[PDB]
PDB file of all heavy atoms in Angstrom:
ATOM      1  N   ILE J 168      -0.397  -1.009   2.869  1.00 21.46           N
ATOM      2  CA  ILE J 168       0.709  -1.588   2.058  1.00 21.46           C
ATOM      3  C   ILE J 168       0.242  -1.659   0.594  1.00 21.46           C
ATOM      4  O   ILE J 168      -0.152  -2.767   0.114  1.00 21.46           O
ATOM      5  CB  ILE J 168       1.154  -2.950   2.617  1.00 21.46           C
ATOM      6  CG1 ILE J 168       1.411  -2.899   4.132  1.00 21.46           C
ATOM      7  CG2 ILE J 168       2.354  -3.489   1.849  1.00 21.46           C
ATOM      8  CD1 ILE J 168       2.538  -1.961   4.573  1.00 21.46           C
ATOM      9  N   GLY J 169       0.311  -0.521  -0.110  1.00 20.65           N
ATOM     10  CA  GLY J 169      -0.054  -0.414  -1.535  1.00 20.65           C
ATOM     11  C   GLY J 169      -1.399   0.271  -1.706  1.00 20.65           C
ATOM     12  O   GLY J 169      -2.401  -0.402  -1.971  1.00 20.65           O
ATOM     13  N   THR J 170      -1.390   1.578  -1.531  1.00 22.62           N
ATOM     14  CA  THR J 170      -2.508   2.528  -1.701  1.00 22.62           C
ATOM     15  C   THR J 170      -3.215   2.271  -3.041  1.00 22.62           C
ATOM     16  O   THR J 170      -2.534   1.913  -4.041  1.00 22.62           O
ATOM     17  CB  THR J 170      -1.911   3.920  -1.455  1.00 22.62           C
ATOM     18  OG1 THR J 170      -2.163   4.162  -0.059  1.00 22.62           O
ATOM     19  CG2 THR J 170      -2.435   5.036  -2.329  1.00 22.62           C
ATOM     20  N   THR J 171      -4.539   2.432  -3.080  1.00 15.08           N
ATOM     21  CA  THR J 171      -5.315   2.096  -4.295  1.00 15.08           C
ATOM     22  C   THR J 171      -4.873   3.055  -5.394  1.00 15.08           C
ATOM     23  O   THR J 171      -4.458   2.555  -6.466  1.00 15.08           O
ATOM     24  CB  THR J 171      -6.825   2.104  -4.072  1.00 15.08           C
ATOM     25  OG1 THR J 171      -7.037   1.118  -3.071  1.00 15.08           O
ATOM     26  CG2 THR J 171      -7.606   1.736  -5.314  1.00 15.08           C
ATOM     27  N   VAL J 172      -4.923   4.363  -5.124  1.00 14.56           N
ATOM     28  CA  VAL J 172      -4.726   5.397  -6.175  1.00 14.56           C
ATOM     29  C   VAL J 172      -3.241   5.507  -6.540  1.00 14.56           C
ATOM     30  O   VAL J 172      -2.984   5.503  -7.750  1.00 14.56           O
ATOM     31  CB  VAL J 172      -5.313   6.758  -5.788  1.00 14.56           C
ATOM     32  CG1 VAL J 172      -4.985   7.790  -6.847  1.00 14.56           C
ATOM     33  CG2 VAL J 172      -6.805   6.693  -5.574  1.00 14.56           C
ATOM     34  N   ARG J 173      -2.308   5.549  -5.573  1.00 15.37           N
ATOM     35  CA  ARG J 173      -0.908   5.990  -5.799  1.00 15.37           C
ATOM     36  C   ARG J 173       0.082   4.858  -5.569  1.00 15.37           C
ATOM     37  O   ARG J 173       1.287   5.054  -5.802  1.00 15.37           O
ATOM     38  CB  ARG J 173      -0.522   7.182  -4.913  1.00 15.37           C
ATOM     39  CG  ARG J 173      -1.368   8.425  -5.138  1.00 15.37           C
ATOM     40  CD  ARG J 173      -1.088   9.654  -4.269  1.00 15.37           C
ATOM     41  NE  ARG J 173      -2.089  10.614  -4.732  1.00 15.37           N
ATOM     42  CZ  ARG J 173      -3.400  10.613  -4.415  1.00 15.37           C
ATOM     43  NH1 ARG J 173      -3.893   9.788  -3.493  1.00 15.37           N
ATOM     44  NH2 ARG J 173      -4.227  11.471  -5.011  1.00 15.37           N
ATOM     45  N   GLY J 174      -0.354   3.708  -5.084  1.00 15.99           N
ATOM     46  CA  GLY J 174       0.596   2.607  -4.804  1.00 15.99           C
ATOM     47  C   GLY J 174       1.609   2.947  -3.715  1.00 15.99           C
ATOM     48  O   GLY J 174       2.683   2.344  -3.693  1.00 15.99           O
ATOM     49  N   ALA J 175       1.237   3.813  -2.777  1.00 14.02           N
ATOM     50  CA  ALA J 175       2.076   4.186  -1.614  1.00 14.02           C
ATOM     51  C   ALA J 175       2.153   3.019  -0.638  1.00 14.02           C
ATOM     52  O   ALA J 175       1.147   2.261  -0.509  1.00 14.02           O
ATOM     53  CB  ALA J 175       1.494   5.385  -0.912  1.00 14.02           C
ATOM     54  N   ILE J 176       3.271   2.931   0.076  1.00 16.42           N
ATOM     55  CA  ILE J 176       3.451   1.943   1.175  1.00 16.42           C
ATOM     56  C   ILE J 176       3.826   2.670   2.465  1.00 16.42           C
ATOM     57  O   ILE J 176       4.984   3.210   2.524  1.00 16.42           O
ATOM     58  CB  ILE J 176       4.481   0.900   0.781  1.00 16.42           C
ATOM     59  CG1 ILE J 176       3.939   0.058  -0.380  1.00 16.42           C
ATOM     60  CG2 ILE J 176       4.860   0.084   2.012  1.00 16.42           C
ATOM     61  CD1 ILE J 176       4.948  -0.849  -1.021  1.00 16.42           C
ATOM     62  N   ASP J 177       2.866   2.700   3.417  1.00 15.41           N
ATOM     63  CA  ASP J 177       3.049   3.246   4.788  1.00 15.41           C
ATOM     64  C   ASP J 177       4.256   2.523   5.385  1.00 15.41           C
ATOM     65  O   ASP J 177       4.276   1.295   5.336  1.00 15.41           O
ATOM     66  CB  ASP J 177       1.775   3.144   5.628  1.00 15.41           C
ATOM     67  CG  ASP J 177       0.582   3.976   5.143  1.00 15.41           C
ATOM     68  OD1 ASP J 177       0.772   4.907   4.290  1.00 15.41           O
ATOM     69  OD2 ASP J 177      -0.552   3.705   5.641  1.00 15.41           O
ATOM     70  N   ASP J 178       5.275   3.266   5.826  1.00 14.10           N
ATOM     71  CA  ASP J 178       6.540   2.691   6.363  1.00 14.10           C
ATOM     72  C   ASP J 178       6.316   2.230   7.802  1.00 14.10           C
ATOM     73  O   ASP J 178       6.216   3.104   8.706  1.00 14.10           O
ATOM     74  CB  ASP J 178       7.651   3.733   6.335  1.00 14.10           C
ATOM     75  CG  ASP J 178       9.010   3.195   6.728  1.00 14.10           C
ATOM     76  OD1 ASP J 178       9.073   2.157   7.458  1.00 14.10           O
ATOM     77  OD2 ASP J 178      10.004   3.844   6.324  1.00 14.10           O
ATOM     78  N   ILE J 179       6.253   0.926   8.033  1.00 17.98           N
ATOM     79  CA  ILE J 179       5.850   0.378   9.360  1.00 17.98           C
ATOM     80  C   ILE J 179       7.072   0.374  10.289  1.00 17.98           C
ATOM     81  O   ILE J 179       6.896   0.409  11.528  1.00 17.98           O
ATOM     82  CB  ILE J 179       5.141  -0.993   9.230  1.00 17.98           C
ATOM     83  CG1 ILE J 179       6.030  -2.071   8.614  1.00 17.98           C
ATOM     84  CG2 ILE J 179       3.828  -0.856   8.459  1.00 17.98           C
ATOM     85  CD1 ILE J 179       5.480  -3.470   8.837  1.00 17.98           C
ATOM     86  N   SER J 180       8.277   0.394   9.732  1.00 18.71           N
ATOM     87  CA  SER J 180       9.526   0.551  10.520  1.00 18.71           C
ATOM     88  C   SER J 180       9.520   1.927  11.199  1.00 18.71           C
ATOM     89  O   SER J 180       9.723   2.004  12.412  1.00 18.71           O
ATOM     90  CB  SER J 180      10.745   0.371   9.651  1.00 18.71           C
ATOM     91  OG  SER J 180      11.891   0.186  10.463  1.00 18.71           O
ATOM     92  N   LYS J 181       9.246   2.968  10.425  1.00 16.90           N
ATOM     93  CA  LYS J 181       9.178   4.366  10.893  1.00 16.90           C
ATOM     94  C   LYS J 181       8.018   4.511  11.880  1.00 16.90           C
ATOM     95  O   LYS J 181       8.244   5.074  12.960  1.00 16.90           O
ATOM     96  CB  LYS J 181       9.050   5.291   9.679  1.00 16.90           C
ATOM     97  CG  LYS J 181       9.143   6.781   9.982  1.00 16.90           C
ATOM     98  CD  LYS J 181       8.624   7.677   8.851  1.00 16.90           C
ATOM     99  CE  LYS J 181       9.493   7.697   7.616  1.00 16.90           C
ATOM    100  NZ  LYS J 181      10.856   8.195   7.929  1.00 16.90           N
ATOM    101  N   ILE J 182       6.823   4.034  11.522  1.00 19.74           N
ATOM    102  CA  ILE J 182       5.621   4.113  12.404  1.00 19.74           C
ATOM    103  C   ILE J 182       6.002   3.523  13.771  1.00 19.74           C
ATOM    104  O   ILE J 182       5.797   4.225  14.783  1.00 19.74           O
ATOM    105  CB  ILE J 182       4.400   3.434  11.753  1.00 19.74           C
ATOM    106  CG1 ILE J 182       3.831   4.266  10.602  1.00 19.74           C
ATOM    107  CG2 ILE J 182       3.323   3.134  12.774  1.00 19.74           C
ATOM    108  CD1 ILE J 182       2.954   3.476   9.630  1.00 19.74           C
ATOM    109  N   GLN J 183       6.613   2.338  13.814  1.00 19.82           N
ATOM    110  CA  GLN J 183       6.899   1.636  15.099  1.00 19.82           C
ATOM    111  C   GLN J 183       8.008   2.375  15.876  1.00 19.82           C
ATOM    112  O   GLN J 183       7.895   2.476  17.080  1.00 19.82           O
ATOM    113  CB  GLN J 183       7.254   0.158  14.864  1.00 19.82           C
ATOM    114  CG  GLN J 183       6.108  -0.711  14.316  1.00 19.82           C
ATOM    115  CD  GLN J 183       6.595  -2.098  13.956  1.00 19.82           C
ATOM    116  OE1 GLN J 183       6.622  -3.009  14.789  1.00 19.82           O
ATOM    117  NE2 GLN J 183       7.101  -2.247  12.738  1.00 19.82           N
ATOM    118  N   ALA J 184       9.057   2.863  15.220  1.00 21.60           N
ATOM    119  CA  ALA J 184      10.149   3.643  15.862  1.00 21.60           C
ATOM    120  C   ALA J 184       9.592   4.934  16.489  1.00 21.60           C
ATOM    121  O   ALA J 184       9.963   5.245  17.639  1.00 21.60           O
ATOM    122  CB  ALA J 184      11.247   3.943  14.855  1.00 21.60           C
ATOM    123  N   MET J 185       8.708   5.625  15.768  1.00 21.10           N
ATOM    124  CA  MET J 185       8.146   6.946  16.129  1.00 21.10           C
ATOM    125  C   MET J 185       7.141   6.798  17.273  1.00 21.10           C
ATOM    126  O   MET J 185       7.080   7.662  18.128  1.00 21.10           O
ATOM    127  CB  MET J 185       7.477   7.588  14.906  1.00 21.10           C
ATOM    128  CG  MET J 185       8.486   8.125  13.887  1.00 21.10           C
ATOM    129  SD  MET J 185       7.758   9.060  12.506  1.00 21.10           S
ATOM    130  CE  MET J 185       6.957  10.425  13.349  1.00 21.10           C
ATOM    131  N   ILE J 186       6.366   5.726  17.286  1.00 19.76           N
ATOM    132  CA  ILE J 186       5.383   5.465  18.368  1.00 19.76           C
ATOM    133  C   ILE J 186       6.193   4.997  19.587  1.00 19.76           C
ATOM    134  O   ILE J 186       5.900   5.446  20.690  1.00 19.76           O
ATOM    135  CB  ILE J 186       4.303   4.480  17.865  1.00 19.76           C
ATOM    136  CG1 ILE J 186       3.384   5.172  16.848  1.00 19.76           C
ATOM    137  CG2 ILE J 186       3.513   3.857  19.014  1.00 19.76           C
ATOM    138  CD1 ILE J 186       2.384   4.267  16.186  1.00 19.76           C
ATOM    139  N   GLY J 187       7.211   4.158  19.387  1.00 19.58           N
ATOM    140  CA  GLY J 187       8.187   3.808  20.439  1.00 19.58           C
ATOM    141  C   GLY J 187       8.740   5.066  21.105  1.00 19.58           C
ATOM    142  O   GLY J 187       8.729   5.136  22.358  1.00 19.58           O
ATOM    143  N   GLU J 188       9.099   6.067  20.292  1.00 21.23           N
ATOM    144  CA  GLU J 188       9.705   7.357  20.728  1.00 21.23           C
ATOM    145  C   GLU J 188       8.697   8.104  21.630  1.00 21.23           C
ATOM    146  O   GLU J 188       9.159   8.842  22.533  1.00 21.23           O
ATOM    147  CB  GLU J 188      10.208   8.081  19.475  1.00 21.23           C
ATOM    148  CG  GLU J 188      11.150   9.247  19.725  1.00 21.23           C
ATOM    149  CD  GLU J 188      12.629   8.957  19.976  1.00 21.23           C
ATOM    150  OE1 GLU J 188      12.941   8.472  21.075  1.00 21.23           O
ATOM    151  OE2 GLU J 188      13.482   9.276  19.089  1.00 21.23           O
ATOM    152  N   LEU J 189       7.386   7.880  21.466  1.00 19.90           N
ATOM    153  CA  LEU J 189       6.325   8.403  22.378  1.00 19.90           C
ATOM    154  C   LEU J 189       6.249   7.601  23.687  1.00 19.90           C
ATOM    155  O   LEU J 189       5.458   7.974  24.553  1.00 19.90           O
ATOM    156  CB  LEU J 189       4.948   8.326  21.706  1.00 19.90           C
ATOM    157  CG  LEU J 189       4.607   9.390  20.682  1.00 19.90           C
ATOM    158  CD1 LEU J 189       3.104   9.451  20.516  1.00 19.90           C
ATOM    159  CD2 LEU J 189       5.157  10.764  21.069  1.00 19.90           C
ATOM    160  N   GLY J 190       6.972   6.503  23.842  1.00 19.51           N
ATOM    161  CA  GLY J 190       6.875   5.717  25.086  1.00 19.51           C
ATOM    162  C   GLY J 190       5.657   4.805  25.130  1.00 19.51           C
ATOM    163  O   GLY J 190       5.273   4.411  26.245  1.00 19.51           O
ATOM    164  N   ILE J 191       5.080   4.451  23.971  1.00 18.31           N
ATOM    165  CA  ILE J 191       4.103   3.335  23.813  1.00 18.31           C
ATOM    166  C   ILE J 191       4.872   2.065  23.447  1.00 18.31           C
ATOM    167  O   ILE J 191       5.610   2.055  22.455  1.00 18.31           O
ATOM    168  CB  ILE J 191       3.036   3.711  22.780  1.00 18.31           C
ATOM    169  CG1 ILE J 191       2.323   4.999  23.188  1.00 18.31           C
ATOM    170  CG2 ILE J 191       2.046   2.566  22.555  1.00 18.31           C
ATOM    171  CD1 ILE J 191       1.346   5.498  22.155  1.00 18.31           C
ATOM    172  N   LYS J 192       4.732   1.025  24.261  1.00 19.14           N
ATOM    173  CA  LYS J 192       5.417  -0.283  24.104  1.00 19.14           C
ATOM    174  C   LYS J 192       4.676  -1.045  23.011  1.00 19.14           C
ATOM    175  O   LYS J 192       3.442  -0.894  22.929  1.00 19.14           O
ATOM    176  CB  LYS J 192       5.402  -1.069  25.421  1.00 19.14           C
ATOM    177  CG  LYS J 192       5.934  -0.332  26.649  1.00 19.14           C
ATOM    178  CD  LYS J 192       4.849   0.093  27.658  1.00 19.14           C
ATOM    179  CE  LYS J 192       4.083   1.371  27.307  1.00 19.14           C
ATOM    180  NZ  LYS J 192       2.795   1.157  26.571  1.00 19.14           N
ATOM    181  N   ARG J 193       5.410  -1.823  22.214  1.00 17.88           N
ATOM    182  CA  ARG J 193       4.884  -2.579  21.043  1.00 17.88           C
ATOM    183  C   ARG J 193       3.674  -3.429  21.461  1.00 17.88           C
ATOM    184  O   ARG J 193       2.684  -3.368  20.742  1.00 17.88           O
ATOM    185  CB  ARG J 193       5.983  -3.426  20.389  1.00 17.88           C
ATOM    186  CG  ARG J 193       5.578  -3.997  19.037  1.00 17.88           C
ATOM    187  CD  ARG J 193       5.135  -2.957  17.993  1.00 17.88           C
ATOM    188  NE  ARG J 193       4.498  -3.582  16.839  1.00 17.88           N
ATOM    189  CZ  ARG J 193       3.198  -3.879  16.734  1.00 17.88           C
ATOM    190  NH1 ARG J 193       2.353  -3.581  17.706  1.00 17.88           N
ATOM    191  NH2 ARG J 193       2.742  -4.469  15.639  1.00 17.88           N
ATOM    192  N   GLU J 194       3.717  -4.098  22.626  1.00 19.68           N
ATOM    193  CA  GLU J 194       2.652  -5.024  23.109  1.00 19.68           C
ATOM    194  C   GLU J 194       1.363  -4.261  23.371  1.00 19.68           C
ATOM    195  O   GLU J 194       0.347  -4.913  23.531  1.00 19.68           O
ATOM    196  CB  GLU J 194       2.938  -5.693  24.452  1.00 19.68           C
ATOM    197  CG  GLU J 194       4.345  -6.202  24.609  1.00 19.68           C
ATOM    198  CD  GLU J 194       5.249  -5.140  25.191  1.00 19.68           C
ATOM    199  OE1 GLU J 194       4.994  -4.752  26.370  1.00 19.68           O
ATOM    200  OE2 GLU J 194       6.161  -4.669  24.438  1.00 19.68           O
ATOM    201  N   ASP J 195       1.415  -2.942  23.494  1.00 17.07           N
ATOM    202  CA  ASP J 195       0.243  -2.143  23.914  1.00 17.07           C
ATOM    203  C   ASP J 195      -0.449  -1.507  22.711  1.00 17.07           C
ATOM    204  O   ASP J 195      -1.359  -0.726  22.930  1.00 17.07           O
ATOM    205  CB  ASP J 195       0.675  -1.132  24.972  1.00 17.07           C
ATOM    206  CG  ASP J 195       0.962  -1.764  26.328  1.00 17.07           C
ATOM    207  OD1 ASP J 195       0.329  -2.807  26.665  1.00 17.07           O
ATOM    208  OD2 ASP J 195       1.824  -1.215  27.037  1.00 17.07           O
ATOM    209  N   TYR J 196      -0.059  -1.828  21.479  1.00 16.15           N
ATOM    210  CA  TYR J 196      -0.836  -1.370  20.296  1.00 16.15           C
ATOM    211  C   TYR J 196      -0.797  -2.407  19.165  1.00 16.15           C
ATOM    212  O   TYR J 196      -0.057  -3.413  19.236  1.00 16.15           O
ATOM    213  CB  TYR J 196      -0.398   0.041  19.876  1.00 16.15           C
ATOM    214  CG  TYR J 196       0.907   0.126  19.142  1.00 16.15           C
ATOM    215  CD1 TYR J 196       0.948   0.219  17.767  1.00 16.15           C
ATOM    216  CD2 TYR J 196       2.105   0.145  19.836  1.00 16.15           C
ATOM    217  CE1 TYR J 196       2.153   0.330  17.096  1.00 16.15           C
ATOM    218  CE2 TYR J 196       3.324   0.231  19.178  1.00 16.15           C
ATOM    219  CZ  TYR J 196       3.343   0.312  17.801  1.00 16.15           C
ATOM    220  OH  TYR J 196       4.535   0.407  17.158  1.00 16.15           O
ATOM    221  N   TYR J 197      -1.609  -2.137  18.145  1.00 18.55           N
ATOM    222  CA  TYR J 197      -1.915  -3.061  17.028  1.00 18.55           C
ATOM    223  C   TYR J 197      -1.597  -2.382  15.692  1.00 18.55           C
ATOM    224  O   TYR J 197      -1.939  -1.175  15.521  1.00 18.55           O
ATOM    225  CB  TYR J 197      -3.389  -3.457  17.087  1.00 18.55           C
ATOM    226  CG  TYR J 197      -3.729  -4.704  16.319  1.00 18.55           C
ATOM    227  CD1 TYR J 197      -3.590  -5.956  16.896  1.00 18.55           C
ATOM    228  CD2 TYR J 197      -4.189  -4.625  15.013  1.00 18.55           C
ATOM    229  CE1 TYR J 197      -3.889  -7.101  16.185  1.00 18.55           C
ATOM    230  CE2 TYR J 197      -4.478  -5.765  14.284  1.00 18.55           C
ATOM    231  CZ  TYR J 197      -4.347  -7.007  14.877  1.00 18.55           C
ATOM    232  OH  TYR J 197      -4.661  -8.136  14.171  1.00 18.55           O
ATOM    233  N   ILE J 198      -1.015  -3.145  14.764  1.00 22.36           N
ATOM    234  CA  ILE J 198      -0.830  -2.725  13.342  1.00 22.36           C
ATOM    235  C   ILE J 198      -1.414  -3.784  12.416  1.00 22.36           C
ATOM    236  O   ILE J 198      -0.885  -4.919  12.408  1.00 22.36           O
ATOM    237  CB  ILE J 198       0.645  -2.490  12.977  1.00 22.36           C
ATOM    238  CG1 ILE J 198       1.304  -1.490  13.935  1.00 22.36           C
ATOM    239  CG2 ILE J 198       0.744  -2.062  11.514  1.00 22.36           C
ATOM    240  CD1 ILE J 198       2.749  -1.198  13.593  1.00 22.36           C
ATOM    241  N   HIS J 199      -2.397  -3.386  11.617  1.00 24.08           N
ATOM    242  CA  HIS J 199      -2.962  -4.199  10.513  1.00 24.08           C
ATOM    243  C   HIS J 199      -2.470  -3.680   9.150  1.00 24.08           C
ATOM    244  O   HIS J 199      -2.618  -2.492   8.874  1.00 24.08           O
ATOM    245  CB  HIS J 199      -4.487  -4.224  10.551  1.00 24.08           C
ATOM    246  CG  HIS J 199      -4.993  -5.066   9.442  1.00 24.08           C
ATOM    247  ND1 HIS J 199      -4.844  -6.424   9.460  1.00 24.08           N
ATOM    248  CD2 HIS J 199      -5.578  -4.747   8.263  1.00 24.08           C
ATOM    249  CE1 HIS J 199      -5.348  -6.919   8.345  1.00 24.08           C
ATOM    250  NE2 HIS J 199      -5.797  -5.908   7.586  1.00 24.08           N
ATOM    251  N   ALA J 200      -1.929  -4.575   8.330  1.00 21.59           N
ATOM    252  CA  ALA J 200      -1.483  -4.325   6.950  1.00 21.59           C
ATOM    253  C   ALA J 200      -2.622  -4.644   5.963  1.00 21.59           C
ATOM    254  O   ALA J 200      -2.924  -5.831   5.776  1.00 21.59           O
ATOM    255  CB  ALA J 200      -0.276  -5.176   6.701  1.00 21.59           C
ATOM    256  N   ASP J 201      -3.247  -3.629   5.371  1.00 16.50           N
ATOM    257  CA  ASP J 201      -3.993  -3.783   4.109  1.00 16.50           C
ATOM    258  C   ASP J 201      -2.966  -3.862   2.987  1.00 16.50           C
ATOM    259  O   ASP J 201      -2.436  -2.837   2.604  1.00 16.50           O
ATOM    260  CB  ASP J 201      -4.985  -2.658   3.862  1.00 16.50           C
ATOM    261  CG  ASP J 201      -5.701  -2.830   2.532  1.00 16.50           C
ATOM    262  OD1 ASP J 201      -5.473  -3.890   1.885  1.00 16.50           O
ATOM    263  OD2 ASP J 201      -6.474  -1.905   2.153  1.00 16.50           O
ATOM    264  N   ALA J 202      -2.682  -5.079   2.543  1.00 15.14           N
ATOM    265  CA  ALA J 202      -1.775  -5.428   1.438  1.00 15.14           C
ATOM    266  C   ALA J 202      -2.565  -6.069   0.285  1.00 15.14           C
ATOM    267  O   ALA J 202      -2.037  -6.962  -0.350  1.00 15.14           O
ATOM    268  CB  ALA J 202      -0.694  -6.344   1.954  1.00 15.14           C
ATOM    269  N   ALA J 203      -3.774  -5.595   0.019  1.00 20.01           N
ATOM    270  CA  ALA J 203      -4.690  -6.180  -0.979  1.00 20.01           C
ATOM    271  C   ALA J 203      -3.917  -6.538  -2.253  1.00 20.01           C
ATOM    272  O   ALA J 203      -3.999  -7.710  -2.674  1.00 20.01           O
ATOM    273  CB  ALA J 203      -5.842  -5.242  -1.270  1.00 20.01           C
TER     274      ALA J 203
END
């Protein structure tokens, strides 16, 4: 959440929808936000 060089923000809505689309349930994985 806010890349050092470019200030990019990894879209966690898209990441979770797309991993959901693989048939991995939310409870079975972890997301950590580096929002320094």
